[model samples]
Target: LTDLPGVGPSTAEKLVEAGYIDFMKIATATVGELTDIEGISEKAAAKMIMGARDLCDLGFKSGIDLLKQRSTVWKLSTSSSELDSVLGGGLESQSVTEFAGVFGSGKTQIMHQSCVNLQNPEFLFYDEEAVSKGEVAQPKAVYIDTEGTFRPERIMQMAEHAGIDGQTVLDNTFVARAYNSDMQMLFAEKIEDLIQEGNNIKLVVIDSLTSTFRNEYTGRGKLAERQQKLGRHMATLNKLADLFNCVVLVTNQVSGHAATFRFFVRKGKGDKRVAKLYDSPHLPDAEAIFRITEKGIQD
Candidate 1:
């Protein structure tokens, strides 16, 4: 911080003590926020922020450089080959994918299956012994549960079926339940801190993204305000996906106007649930059918 222009020894000490020890924090801070610290004038704060930004600059990269970086985009396989094929190998990182459907449409099931799939030995392993044995560190996942849909028991069942340890899978996933829209938005912001703290968070799942907003912002009179907030929230998700090179999957309750991949689940013969994709970028404007079996979603 002291290396930043206009930030002397005293300013640096104050910034470090005030929890602004990093260039990103300083560069992202608002002028008003930095001016709150003692001895930091508005002019000095602006200069320091600009300097911090310059130091942490992510300058333009060539197209070839971007193509090389695509290698870092991980695809968390859905285990179902049919689904994987439609999803371009699986869910791609550095992008925000929204899944919209009605109640019991297997939206939550897909999210749960993703957690289990990521826990597979070929993907990520949560067991400490494996890491100590020189196995690659397992990437972490964050699940923001807005409507009480997250189930560790459900994840355990899927993990067991995949021949992985249920307890280890449960331990690796970080789940946060949001009771209201404010808390839900706060959780979205807090995910960046989690990533910055050195958690190899490769997947972020938000099950039912618009529930709280729908409930709180009732009536068409509040539609504009609701959309504005929703837009901001989505913009944050997009930025996080690209900035961290991670996959962001958000499940949504059926809203007519929001453009997204739609899934329809219906009761099928015997004990099975039929799963169909109605709209997706990878596939044509046609329907594809599958089934939600006891083990998990299957073709």
Candidate 2:
């Protein structure tokens, strides 16, 4: 195959999973190291190495080219029209957006709704008028519940509101509960394998990423160590955002770093909640409010 010489689609994907994302990476890899791939043969590895050596991109691109790649980034609706408007779209792919605030601020509820909203196709046009492309595809959700706030009833309620089968929503979504920081980090770190093996997974949510870490004993020594590990965690999630071309939405019950869009969320009267934009690349400091109901958040 010209696209990935001497390797089938499966092997090519596995090669990518092995971290050979470019011809140069493959070219630099030793024959023995290349053989570490499950389906790649020694002969095939040699062929791949030679082919890679004979060709490579300079890795330099002008602003125009960068724009072309960046333009490919799309958004998944956060369900609430005002929330999406404040976000300049919705949850943007290849970006990490954090929702941070105190408890009862609707962090967990928003996270849950997003998990459902990302999957329920009707929500794409749930607010806007008819603009369907006629070739619509459903997005998958991967939720990492750290604070044990994931409830089936809420998902079902949102799915019902969107006119989709509730059981179908549950089946379409993938949930991993991590009670502590180590498990949470491991779940995110191993997320690549999930991407490589599955279909489209456009939404990745980590509800309240700081709770478990907060339980860690407070001290300067541990704080130093804890921050280092947190960086690694965010870095891994950031890498996944680019690698999978998916939206990374994590609610911090904290960061200005590693997150492209950061919102300070707080609760209001009744079911109303307000989300303030604290950090963003394309938006100014702004805030918006919405109500969380039996059907999910609405403007």
Candidate 3:
């Protein structure tokens, strides 16, 4: 933007024309990247980046000040209070919580429940029972279904069991069926536009993150290519979480996945599901035993 130190009106136009849409974009541009814009020099680029960095992180700060900011981390709750309690108060925003396990594990179900749980309770009408419990809600959620796993009917059932209105949950959720990794990545890109419009999206759920990549690419020759693409997707999700300050819940196949919190979910004996805390900074290393019934998550 022209407000930035080195970005004059014409210069800003040139940068935008070069696909640098905003100052944040310019802020990340290396000297060479910015200089690719004709008439921009390395020194000028440095000044612009300095200004943009100031606009964001304000240079640097004491450790505890950063700690204080970390303390402000908000979270989105799943279905079970016990499950919720173990993960440092639900799936904290600004990071992806990977649910890793075998196919039979309840990753998709939990993810669906999260979609219902992440609603804006204040804006919607609910039954007296749900109201008395103060059922959790947020602004909205974006769900990307890879591998044909997402079901509105399941979300409806979860909501119905939770004693909340099913239709409202579906209405608040934006569902996209991504058939391939490219589509899934672009879906993440499109989310920025959705966020830019001030929709206040609080959660982005990618059910079974690795399915399409694994299915489409075959053999070890393509393994690195697939991993590289997967890494790109991960980095983009990381950026999305930080920029928008939202929750990203990713389900994978038994995959110690940066991921702020990684849970090794699995099928327990009989109908029970088990989730062990694989890694996290805040959440304690613990396990939760929850079941998916006609009603949703419970002991």
Instruction: Estimate every model's Cα lDDT from 0 to 1.
Output: 0.74, 0.77, 0.77
Q: Tell me how candidate 1 scores on lDDT.
A: 0.74
Poorest 10 consecutive residues by lDDT, candidate 2 = 126-135
1-299: candidate 2 lDDT, tens digit per residue: 34656867887888877867666557767899889887889999998887877675435689777766666576777777888888887878778999998867888888878777766564543222222233235567788988888999998998898777788778877889998989999988767666556556777888867777778736656787778878888987887786566788888774224688998988889988889998898888888888988888887
Give the runs in model 2 whose Cα sits over 4 Å from its true position.
1-58, 122-138, 254-257
C-alpha lDDT of residue 252 in model 3: 89
What is the C-alpha lDDT profile of model 1 across 137-241, one tens digit per residue? 576789999989788888888888788888887777899999987888889888878766767777888887888888998897979988988888887787777
lDDT of 1 at 168: 81
Best by TM-score: 3
The Cα RMSD in angstroms, rounded to one decimal, for candidate 1 relative to the true structure is: 5.0
For model 1, state the Cα shift of residue 101 in Å: 1.4
Model 2 score (lDDT): 0.77
Q: TM-score order of candidates, best first? A: 3, 2, 1
Off by over 4 Å in 1: 1-57, 124-136, 255-288
Winner on TM-score (1 vs 2):
2
